[PDB]
Amino acid sequence: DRVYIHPFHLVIHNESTCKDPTFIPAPIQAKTSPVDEKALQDQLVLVAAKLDTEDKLRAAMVGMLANFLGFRIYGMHSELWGVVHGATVLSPTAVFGTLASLYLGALDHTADRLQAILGVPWKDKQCTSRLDAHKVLSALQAVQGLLVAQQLLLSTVVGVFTAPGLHLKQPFVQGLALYTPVVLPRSLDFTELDVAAEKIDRFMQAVTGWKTGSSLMGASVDSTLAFNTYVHFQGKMKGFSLLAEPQEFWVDQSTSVSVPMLSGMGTFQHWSDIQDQFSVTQVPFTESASLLLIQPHYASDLDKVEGLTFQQNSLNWMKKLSPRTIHLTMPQLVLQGSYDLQDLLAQAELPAILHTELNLQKLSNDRIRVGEVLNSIFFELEADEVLEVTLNRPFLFAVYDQSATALHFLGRVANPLS
Ligand SMILES: *[C@@H]1O[C@H](CO)[C@@H](O[C@@H]2O[C@H](CO)[C@@H](O[C@@H]3O[C@H](CO)[C@@H](O)[C@H](O)[C@@H]3O)[C@H](O)[C@H]2NC(C)=O)[C@H](O)[C@H]1NC(C)=O
């Protein structure tokens, strides 16, 4: 039958769609080849170039769902950036994919309560009403390719670290492959969290080359699973050059810091909301991919303007933009941060879903006790009459792809270096 309770008809099971091999992941110290990002990129544009009409529509639908979940997380936090360690950056698509990956191996209420957080309700307990995890995970990889299909590099890596002797069901890892080709299941002993974390740090650093440095803070010794998602972004600025001399960045009224600055001159979409007092600048990476820069007219209104950024009307002022001849000067961004979804979605009772009456039996029939659910981000901006736009004070930024209507990152820059 036709769906009415929600317009997300392409993410649920259809009529047709709606004794398992296992294995121990090799020990983490087992030498593994590094990630060939260049090869990964080619696979992602291929995925996007050969999409069917329906799959292309489902990709935009997931990007829209990921945006809504991001807006929810901000509304349920008195202080959002106290949970994030390192750079204050957030990836709605990665958070949505991490939960969709947990929902892949969930059952019964655990799967329903996860489907609720993802933002798709049900009017009954029919199989059809539930989410099709395969279609969701496959659609996320589509928006990854739709971003780099057109200067841009996006690499998503998943690390499933299990306890020694824990059997992971083959079909589960086979489902994660729909999300990203780079799935890294490895077995790790959780009886020494201090060294167990150091094994992951060097393992991920050797495999990827990116530092993450997560010491398994929220994890305990009885834990048996560490589901981590690592994303790396690298964007080239159209016609921007790195200035040899730094400039001052005012973290507050009293103190400033010298920082490397990017300078560029081009016709950019711009808008200044007078009532709320903030300006929005758009620097395109491609035609459908661009960088949104939100600067409050006065630094004291940062938290306020951010409240208007993390909402659905933020996408309404993509129309209010207008072409302008602008000379933009902003800091060089090489950011690294991380955050646990259990802390992000604490007010949504995610820690209660992952620790009480847990049912991840499609992931593994062995007993599971979540140590951490991590999102590690490595964000980079690189170089190649008039309204001067200078970001010499805290500001907000966002990356948006029109092809999939997806917000890949939402960040805050209070200090370019830390
Ligand atoms: C419900 O959604 C599922 C998506 O999982 C659809 O499954 C896919 O259906 C197509 C049919 O158009 C299958 O293609 C066929 O594959 C066989 C090989 O087995 C080939 O010989 C046929 O010529 C055709 O290409 C596709 O394999 C199948 N994929 C999966 C994963 O099941 C299903 O069709 C949808 N049903 C409805 C009623 O919308």
Swiss-Prot record:
Transmembrane segments: none annotated. Changing residue 10 to F: Risk factor for pre-eclampsia; alters the reactions with renin and angiotensin-converting enzyme. The modification Beta-decarboxylated aspartate is found at residue 1. It is found in: Secreted. Expressed by the liver and secreted in plasma. Changing residue 156 to M: Risk factor for hypertension. PROSITE patterns: SERPIN (PS00284). Glycans are attached at residues 14, 126, 253, 277. Keywords: Disease variant, Disulfide bond, Glycoprotein, Secreted, Signal, Vasoactive, Vasoconstrictor. One of its GO terms (biological process) is positive regulation of miRNA transcription. Beta-decarboxylation of Asp-1 in angiotensin-2, by mononuclear leukocytes produces alanine. The resulting peptide form, angiotensin-A, has the same affinity for the AT1 receptor as angiotensin-2, but a higher affinity for the AT2 receptor. In response to low blood pressure, the enzyme renin/REN cleaves angiotensinogen to produce angiotensin-1. Angiotensin-1 is a substrate of ACE (angiotensin converting enzyme) that removes a dipeptide to yield the physiologically active peptide angiotensin-2. Angiotensin-1 and angiotensin-2 can be further processed to generate angiotensin-3, angiotensin-4. Angiotensin 1-9 is cleaved from angiotensin-1 by ACE2 and can be further processed by ACE to produce angiotensin 1-7, angiotensin 1-5 and angiotensin 1-4. SUPFAM superfamilies: Serpins. Disulfide bonds join 18-127. GO terms for cellular component: blood microparticle; collagen-containing extracellular matrix; extracellular exosome; extracellular region; extracellular space. GO terms for molecular function: growth factor activity; hormone activity; serine-type endopeptidase inhibitor activity; type 1 angiotensin receptor binding; type 2 angiotensin receptor binding. Essential component of the renin-angiotensin system (RAS), a potent regulator of blood pressure, body fluid and electrolyte homeostasis. Belongs to the serpin family. During pregnancy, exists as a disulfide-linked 2:2 heterotetramer with the proform of PRG2 and as a complex (probably a 2:2:2 heterohexamer) with pro-PRG2 and C3dg. This is Angiotensinogen. The lineage of its organism: Eukaryota, Metazoa, Chordata, Craniata, Vertebrata.
